[PDB]
């Protein structure tokens, strides 16, 4: 687990020093830079991710778990803890993704889709309970909060 934290340290320095190197050489009257400075749509993570480097593809707060025996895909060696074998993309969305990097980024995207889909039945029953328990309370004219009874 010490190795995991150091690899995530060395890999996430690459995204910062790659993203702070593209934002220094963008001219003004760039359109994503204008749309990110005025906060209307986007950010600096998105510009630095579709120009410089798509970062570590993380699933459940960690690197990509092994789907096969002791490796993520058959395309890598067993027990390899390299960046490319556990979900570090090096390309941007400009230069396009390789097959393994595309598959890992799709793995990281389906978690967002499934959390959005599960979120709905996850929360609505809670709000139904809160409303059924709290709907009676009122602020009276004598500055107190009383129930119906």
């Amino acid at each position: 687990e010490t190795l995991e934290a150091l690899i995530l340290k060395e890999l996430s320095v690459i995204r910062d020093h790659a993203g702070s190197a593209c934002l220094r050489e963008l001219d003004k009257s760039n359109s994503p830079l204008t749309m990110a400075l005025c906060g209307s749509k986007g950010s600096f993570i998105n510009i630095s991710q579709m120009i410089a480097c798509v970062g570590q593809q993380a699933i459940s707060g960690s690197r990509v778990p092994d789907g096969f025996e002791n490796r993520s895909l058959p395309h890598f060696e067993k027990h390899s803890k390299l960046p490319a074998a556990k979900g570090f993309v090096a390309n941007s969305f400009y230069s396009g993704l390789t097959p393994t990097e595309f598959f890992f980024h799709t793995m990281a995207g389906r978690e967002g889709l499934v959390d959005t889909a599960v979120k709905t039945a996850e929360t609505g029953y809670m709000q139904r309970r809160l409303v059924k328990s709290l709907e009676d309370l009122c602020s009276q004219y004598d500055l107190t909060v009383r129930s119906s009874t």
């Binding site: 204008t34 749309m35 005025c38 209307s40 749509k41």
Partner: protein
């Protein structure tokens, strides 16, 4: 709302009291801030900020 094939509902109130409880209490000019933390919700959006 996001204008990507979005359906919204409508209700015409059928009583004068149902009008006046909807205008004074439920109008957009009287609901600019959210009741959660007092922050404004009706404000500018993309291409009105840019």
């Amino acid at each position: 709302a996001d204008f990507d094939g979005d359906e919204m509902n409508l209700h015409l109130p059928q009583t004068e009291e149902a009008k006046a409880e909807a205008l004074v209490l439920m109008g957009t000019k009287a609901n600019l801030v959210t009741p959660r933390n007092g922050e404004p919700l009706i404000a500018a959006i993309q291409d009105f900020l840019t």
